[model samples]
Target: GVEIETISPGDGRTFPKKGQTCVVHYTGMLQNGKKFDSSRDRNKPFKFRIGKQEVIKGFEEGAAQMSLGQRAKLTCTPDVAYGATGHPGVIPPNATLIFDVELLNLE
Candidate 1:
């Protein structure tokens, strides 16, 4: 299987830090290589709190490592990716998620 890498740090926001919010374009997939979600497909971007847990753990962690215009591929463990319970019908219990992300902006 292909490995996933995180582009950002864990403790603090990367370049363009100190923003109340951040925006990004991202694509998520199953480790088996199935597409899950994509902001590019929607022709829109996703926004979230930088330090807050507004998004999943892996996302928050990865976002902290990216600078504006940086991109990375993150492999999120079940716990940090999605809880063990998962999303009832959407995700199975203990499923991992893969995210290919681009940090578009911070504001």
Candidate 2:
């Protein structure tokens, strides 16, 4: 299961729906506490469409729980995250990951 720890209560009560596009500023890291991929450092709000299964499994589910403009930390274990194989080079096998997420927009 994924864990959500909210840092900001957010502005509106809107939760993104399937087929909608989500915009976010995120910093992803490992249990070892190292940055692998991040967009917030550049002040970038990355975009992704939901219901496409394109993002990480845990990430897909976790971000869905966010309200617009909400900021939270998502904790995902290996099973819910990068499995045994993991991503090439960047993430290790059987790793537990944490992502700091802020919902920038949805449409």
Q: State how far residue 3 of model 2 sits from its true place (Å).
A: 0.7
Query: Highest lDDT: which candidate?
Result: 2
lDDT score, candidate 2: 0.85
Quote model 1's TM-score: 0.79
lDDT of 2 by residue, 1-107 (tens): 88899986777579899788889888888886678888967866787888988887889899888898789899988986677888888887889988988887857
Q: What RMSD does each model have against the real structure?
A: 4.7, 1.5
Global lDDT for candidate 1?
A: 0.71
State TM-scores per candidate: 0.79, 0.90
TM-score of 2: 0.90
Give lDDT tens digits, candidate 1, residues 41-91: 788787666665668777777666667666778778887755567786677
- Give candidate 2's error at residue 80 in angstroms: 2.5
